[PDB]
Amino acid sequence: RIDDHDFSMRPGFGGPAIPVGVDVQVESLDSISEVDMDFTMTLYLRHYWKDERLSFPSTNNLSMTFDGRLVKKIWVPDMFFVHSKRSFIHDTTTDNVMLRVQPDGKVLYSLRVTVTAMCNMDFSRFPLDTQTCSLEIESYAYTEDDLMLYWKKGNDSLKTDERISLSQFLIQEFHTTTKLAFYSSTGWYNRLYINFTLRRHIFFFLLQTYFPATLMVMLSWVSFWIDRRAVPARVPLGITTVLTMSTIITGVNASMPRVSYIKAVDIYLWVSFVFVFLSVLEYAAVNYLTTVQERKEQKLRDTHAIDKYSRIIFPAAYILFNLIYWSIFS
Amino acid sequence: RIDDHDFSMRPGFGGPAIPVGVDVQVESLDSISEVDMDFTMTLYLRHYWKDERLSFPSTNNLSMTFDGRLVKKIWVPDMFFVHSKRSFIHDTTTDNVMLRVQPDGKVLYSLRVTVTAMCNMDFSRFPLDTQTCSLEIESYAYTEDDLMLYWKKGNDSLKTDERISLSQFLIQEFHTTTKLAFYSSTGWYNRLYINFTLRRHIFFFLLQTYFPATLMVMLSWVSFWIDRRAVPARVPLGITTVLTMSTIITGVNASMPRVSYIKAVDIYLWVSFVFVFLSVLEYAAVNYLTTVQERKEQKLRDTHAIDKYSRIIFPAAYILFNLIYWSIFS
Amino acid sequence: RIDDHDFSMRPGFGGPAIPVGVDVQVESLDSISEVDMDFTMTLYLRHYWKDERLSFPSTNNLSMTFDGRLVKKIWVPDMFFVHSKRSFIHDTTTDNVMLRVQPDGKVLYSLRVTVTAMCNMDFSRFPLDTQTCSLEIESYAYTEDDLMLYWKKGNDSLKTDERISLSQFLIQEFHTTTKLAFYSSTGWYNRLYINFTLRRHIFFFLLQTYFPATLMVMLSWVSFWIDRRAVPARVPLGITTVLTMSTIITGVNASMPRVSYIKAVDIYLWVSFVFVFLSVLEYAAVNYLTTVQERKEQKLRDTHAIDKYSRIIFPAAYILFNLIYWSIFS
Amino acid sequence: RIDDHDFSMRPGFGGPAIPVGVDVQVESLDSISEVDMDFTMTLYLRHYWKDERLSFPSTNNLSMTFDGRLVKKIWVPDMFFVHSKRSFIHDTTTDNVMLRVQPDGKVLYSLRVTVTAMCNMDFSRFPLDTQTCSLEIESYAYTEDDLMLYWKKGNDSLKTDERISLSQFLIQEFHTTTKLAFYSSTGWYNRLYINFTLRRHIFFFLLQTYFPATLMVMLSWVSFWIDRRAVPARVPLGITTVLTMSTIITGVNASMPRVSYIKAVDIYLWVSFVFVFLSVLEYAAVNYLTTVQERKEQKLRDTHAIDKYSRIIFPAAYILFNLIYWSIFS
Amino acid sequence: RIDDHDFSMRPGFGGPAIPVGVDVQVESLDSISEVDMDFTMTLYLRHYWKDERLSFPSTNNLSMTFDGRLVKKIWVPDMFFVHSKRSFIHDTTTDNVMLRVQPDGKVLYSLRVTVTAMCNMDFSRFPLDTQTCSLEIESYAYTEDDLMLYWKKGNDSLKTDERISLSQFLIQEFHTTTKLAFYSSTGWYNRLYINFTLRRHIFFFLLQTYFPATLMVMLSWVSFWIDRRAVPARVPLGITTVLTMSTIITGVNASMPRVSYIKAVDIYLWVSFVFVFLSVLEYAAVNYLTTVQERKEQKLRDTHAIDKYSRIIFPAAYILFNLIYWSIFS
Ligand SMILES: C=C(C)[C@@H]1[C@H]2OC(=O)[C@@H]1[C@]1(O)C[C@H]3O[C@]34C(=O)O[C@H]2[C@]14C
Ligand SMILES: *[C@@H]1O[C@H](CO)[C@@H](O)[C@H](O)[C@H]1NC(C)=O
Ligand SMILES: *[C@@H]1O[C@H](CO)[C@@H](O)[C@H](O)[C@H]1NC(C)=O
Ligand SMILES: *[C@@H]1O[C@H](CO)[C@@H](O)[C@H](O)[C@H]1NC(C)=O
Ligand SMILES: *[C@@H]1O[C@H](CO)[C@@H](O)[C@H](O)[C@H]1NC(C)=O
Ligand SMILES: *[C@@H]1O[C@H](CO)[C@@H](O)[C@H](O)[C@H]1NC(C)=O
Ligand SMILES: *[C@@H]1O[C@H](CO)[C@@H](O)[C@H](O)[C@H]1NC(C)=O
Ligand SMILES: *[C@@H]1O[C@H](CO)[C@@H](O)[C@H](O)[C@H]1NC(C)=O
Ligand SMILES: *[C@@H]1O[C@H](CO)[C@@H](O)[C@H](O)[C@H]1NC(C)=O
Ligand SMILES: *[C@@H]1O[C@H](CO)[C@@H](O)[C@H](O)[C@H]1NC(C)=O
Ligand SMILES: CCCCCCCC
Ligand SMILES: CCCCCCCC
Ligand SMILES: CCCCCCCC
Ligand SMILES: CCCCCCCC
Ligand SMILES: CCCCCC
Ligand SMILES: CCCCCC
Ligand SMILES: CCCCCC
Ligand SMILES: CCCCCC
Ligand SMILES: CCCCCC
Ligand SMILES: CCCCCC
Ligand SMILES: CCCCCC
Ligand SMILES: CCCCCC
């Protein structure tokens, strides 16, 4: 009896709020953006409510599935995703819409959607960071006085596919919560949350960034073991180490997020750069002192202490730095 | 009585202009494009007007929320964003539209939209710049004689979310204004403005750009303290420092905005490059003078002054440059 | 008699399930993304079923072709692609839809669609890896009690275009299968699968990555055949070889997948890098020992063993590593 | 009286052609793509014509504004942009359409559109080039016998926003013209043209490209003043200068247009590269001659002329090249 | 008399096939993608057929042009592009559709469309390659028994714009062909082909890639003319040349197509790399032999043949390689 009723008014229009239950199955997590600070998810969204205007006579007490072109002729709750950037409903080969109605008016409605939603990421410990994210569901036009939104089975209303995986992150700790939201100009609304945690894998970053910089720092210590008389052997080695470290730094910066603070990897890289710089300065000082001594001996007419002490001081300083660093950012 | 009226005509058609009030809540600022000089904002837009054709009997003077499919059967204000590049209305899971009507005909109409709009950025002080942006709302079809547009609550009609954030900028000073606009061929219209100010964070740029250039300039000064007899040691240091500075400049230029004037960072980088070039020329001059002196000695049959004066002159000049630069731009 | 029936209800509504057969012809395989882990396909999809509501009088028992605007007036199966990211129906110059009806109600329905679908990839043997993929077809609203989905001709139902070719992969082993799916809140559904296997071509990687690293290792081995007394000849060669290998590694990393586990190419490149590093350290040790001996003889007042042994030891270790590597990874 | 007419037929159907006037205001120039040779423009397009089927009684002879849903119910001129690649009408918060009708049937119709259209470009003088572009408006379905398209006022029909600007170009000389177009299979049509000129800002390219190459040539000239007995000093400087120039050329080539002819900047860069190459060859010749003479003198048992002549010849040749180059391309 | 007919059936439904002629004017060739293997074209597509149901009384025997909203109420041929990736019809400021009807029922129907279509490119001779491409037009629903598709004027039915051009290719030899296509499940269909040939310009590659590799190979040959006693001159030169060649190869490989076989440019580049490698090995051999002879002289107590032989062998071998290469690949 579609044609006999006005479906621009909710069930119970003018009376108490109508309960609407929600059930979600998560299908996949498609991508994460560190410059845009958002994520994309595909899910099946289910609604439960009753409308006495949709009853029909039957002897079986069983639900029937209808084509889905009928959805545009009846009242349907208006859910939307808060703090989202873009979304759409899949529609091949037809709209991905299910409608099942029982003889007493109970309705099950189901959509397949894709949502891109924002989140606040902290990179102060990158690439050792851990992030938390949430997707928020809320009705748009109806306040809690007209429509009451809740999880259909409480904590049991959220399911996930076994094939959910991201190549760069470990996904854990799915759960659901609720909260009441307030708008100064419209009223009070009930929000539903889907929360989860992401843990990044660190092997790639270690192998591609920490390994080369440490190797170049250790290469800069070769200079201390070379006879100081070979100036065109010790100067080129230091300057080439500086050039290699700078090129590595640029190549790494080509792929990094940009924030108003500095990530742990930046601290590591610039400490290595300063170490190489100080090695070059030390050799310059040694050469100057040797020349001065030669001039004084001419006027009057072995390993230099600085080299033999730096051979111990430099490795100790780097080892201490690494101990503190991997005790803090473990 | 939707079917009993013609809603292609405005309320008060043929008579005085109909007042329309506006109220905006800002949800987020998504991105800033320095190449295209624009920004993307998501907001809630609310309209207020009275229409006697939409009155209905009641007892409680309370507004009732209707489905939202009636927005295409009644008259609605026609507003658009001026100097925008693209925009859309969110439509998952349905159109994000609210409609509330009071018994006497007062209407509340609400939309959720995403808009990309342009702004004129001045990069002459980059990366220390400050920009002023604005978003403009105006009616399209109706001049001020047909439609009167104003802020609903004065300067209290703009609200912002606590989660507004940008990774590169600090946002401040949201406020609203009005101004009359004129088109030669159509008439006079009234604009509404939303203004805000953006200030860039500078630590990332300092560490990634200013620090390595200073370090390379300081490394170019070691040549002054090395014995002038070691030509195959002093020449490679200068040419390698020049090469490293060139690679750093290229890597920096890869990510910068292009303008017909110079930004502060380019001034700093090219002054450093000139310093390294001059150091190479100084060693060339010393070598030539030494050779000439030796030739004179042969035909007749200590530290060269240039080095001992350059060791003082170069750091003093660079410090003077840094003082002037960081007093001008700070 | 389109106007005499209600086509919001399936044929057999209230009774046994309606059998629906499926045929597919694959037209092309468009692209593969190793970052988002998906593939794009264009195919022709065909549906077969009977509907006695679509009969008409005739003497020929021959199919008639109808315009295709009639598709939106009649009941049609609602197939969708499981685990897909986006899809669309081509619509130039009109919708690519065919409708062909026999006098007794047998219906042939055909669409041209493009689908992007996700697939999990294992990159541990990259670039020698073999990948498998599948596309899944299922009904959205009807369970196996309402709709019976099957392959129309069993194994003969899948045809492919002669022109299917990807520049990076060899495509083989197309075949089909079926499985029964379950959703905890809706019911049981029958899934159809299209399976295929990809084999990557390896010539490009052999030319671009393995060759330069081997050449650089053999170039670094030159150091052991140069007289050890030429320190400013032997040190620069090693440090420049390290710089070149780092440049090569960065250039290769620019185009490689990022996973938490190590790929074969990364193992090869970093083993080569360590070989060069060890060569530099060996020369440093030789220089130090020579200087120590000279000082000892002065206090008391030919080829060094290490170089002679390294000329044999280094190539043998590299050849053994290569044999192991190419036995493990084929 | 919309419902009493058939609006598939133009006014005057079967008789003389209906005149249509056009007036345009340009709002912005959004972007320019040198790779694809196109530009993006946003404009307001206005149409003027008379249709007596749209008359109505009135007492004040004043134009009235209608909702804009009526455009789809009445006849409208069908203008399109020739040689465009894509376009759209802005539709937030509704279609940006104005419709004003006078009591005697005169109609004003106004659209806000964004068009991307091609502009052919000659890069032979890049980056000192000047380009011209045009946007073309034409009727699709009606020939000059059915529709007469003209500029509503003349040269005064084009207005531009005060804020139109580009980050790379100076915009000048907006004006209009008309021409008659012919299609072999359909007929003759009127075209309207909007013409403008773009001139590039040179400074950025000068500083980023010409300055480094000149500095590197002047650095390669340093070799001529170094004592010819310092072979391990003179060879590295030349080879490192060549490497630096190659790196600069690659970094610049990352950003340049690709055409079948040669741009000016390529001429400058490759001439500089040839100069550095020649400097290296001259040093090689000097060393060979010195060794030959030394061997002859030993068997029998000052500055070399080539160096003293190169010190004069190289700067003079480069200065002559610059004097010619900056005169040809002005 | 639109409402008096059922236009869901083709003209002649139940009888012989209806002839449809096709006429095409090509407006532009917009882009070519070598990574995707496709191209984009904009064209005007014209159809001719007769329909007695569209006859109307008249006195002038002339064509009448209709609005184009009638296309959704009458029967229209269903052409589509085979092996296409995406396409659309331009719709600014309205649908770019023309419809003309003669009194006897003959119809001219015209569309302006943009199509992306695939092409199998062969890059063996890149960048000296020549490619052929085609665009295919076919009906979707009607077999050759129901609809006869043919060129309206034979080979004179294809016209091309005078402004068609591509920056990287020369376009030649537009012509048309036809063929009969078979589908195993549906039937036989007529296809129309639009052919063209593309020739790549090679000046860009000759300047950017071949020239510097030849220059670096010739720079490697300088070492043979340098006194062999200057080891720290001849070793650094070779290693720096190797580094420069590797950087050049990386920079050019950054942008080139990837295939399972080797392109001509990679053959040239890697042969050059091998030449530089062999020069380094030759100098190492010379140094070792000289040291061995000096040791023999010590135990007993001119230019080396290898260098003077290589001064002839290396240039001649490179010349032979170039003569063969430029004779095979033209
Ligand atoms: C630019 C580079 C690679 C380095 C720089 O210093 C080095 O040690 C490298 C070397 O290749 C070897 C040595 O000849 C060099 C020189 O004097 O400066 C340069 C030369 C060319
Ligand atoms: C869901 O989990 C939360 C975790 O804190 C818990 O507080 C809540 O009681 C749980 N609800 C159900 C229904 O299990
Ligand atoms: C509310 O009702 C009172 C009467 O009780 C009336 O005076 C007042 O105008 C009403 N307000 C509105 C906004 O309709
Ligand atoms: C709103 O407040 C701002 C605060 O700076 C003020 O400048 C402006 O004049 C105020 N406008 C009105 C209408 O009160
Ligand atoms: C086709 O016609 C034959 C008679 O020649 C008849 O026996 C058969 O049932 C018909 N088939 C269909 C599908 O109508
Ligand atoms: C049917 O074909 C598929 C193709 O992959 C094959 O796997 C399967 O074994 C075949 N089954 C039979 C019964 O032939
Ligand atoms: C213009 O308007 C005046 C009234 O101001 C009216 O008298 C006159 O007839 C109108 N002219 C036309 C051409 O409509
Ligand atoms: C419009 O003005 C321009 C100004 O340069 C002129 O070139 C052109 O001929 C004028 N056209 C007409 C129609 O007056
Ligand atoms: C040609 O047109 C005239 C009307 O001008 C008409 O009378 C005549 O029948 C037409 N001839 C043909 C062959 O259609
Ligand atoms: C059209 O021209 C092509 C050119 O190759 C030729 O093959 C074909 O036979 C021609 N057809 C006609 C009808 O002239
Ligand atoms: C194989 C990875 C080694 C990483 C070492 C990191 C030392 C800080
Ligand atoms: C044609 C390239 C061959 C590369 C072989 C690499 C062996 C480690
Ligand atoms: C700051 C621009 C310098 C340009 C120098 C050009 C020399 C030919
Ligand atoms: C200006 C183009 C030079 C091309 C040289 C090619 C040498 C093989
Ligand atoms: C800059 C190093 C100088 C050393 C003086 C002892
Ligand atoms: C070498 C540091 C490893 C740290 C692992 C958490
Ligand atoms: C955040 C660092 C600021 C430094 C100002 C001199
Ligand atoms: C404002 C122009 C500055 C140029 C500096 C080289
Ligand atoms: C080219 C500069 C050298 C200076 C010697 C007088
Ligand atoms: C398993 C990690 C190997 C790293 C070799 C450098
Ligand atoms: C790195 C120096 C090696 C010294 C071993 C005796
Ligand atoms: C390679 C240059 C040699 C010069 C002989 C005059």
Ligand SMILES: CCCCCC
């Ligand atoms: C630049 C000074 C040159 C002197 C030549 C004798």
Ligand SMILES: CCCCCC
């Ligand atoms: C240094 C060349 C400047 C040219 C200005 C047009």
Ligand SMILES: CCCCCC
């Ligand atoms: C055509 C490929 C040849 C490869 C030779 C190693």
Ligand SMILES: CCCCCC
């Ligand atoms: C590595 C090549 C050395 C040549 C003398 C055996």
Ligand SMILES: CCCCCC
């Ligand atoms: C002395 C010049 C030899 C040239 C051989 C090609």
Ligand SMILES: CCCCCC
């Ligand atoms: C096709 C021209 C080749 C020129 C090689 C020097």
Ligand SMILES: [Cl-]
């Ligand atoms: Cl580099």
Ligand SMILES: [Cl-]
């Ligand atoms: Cl480099």
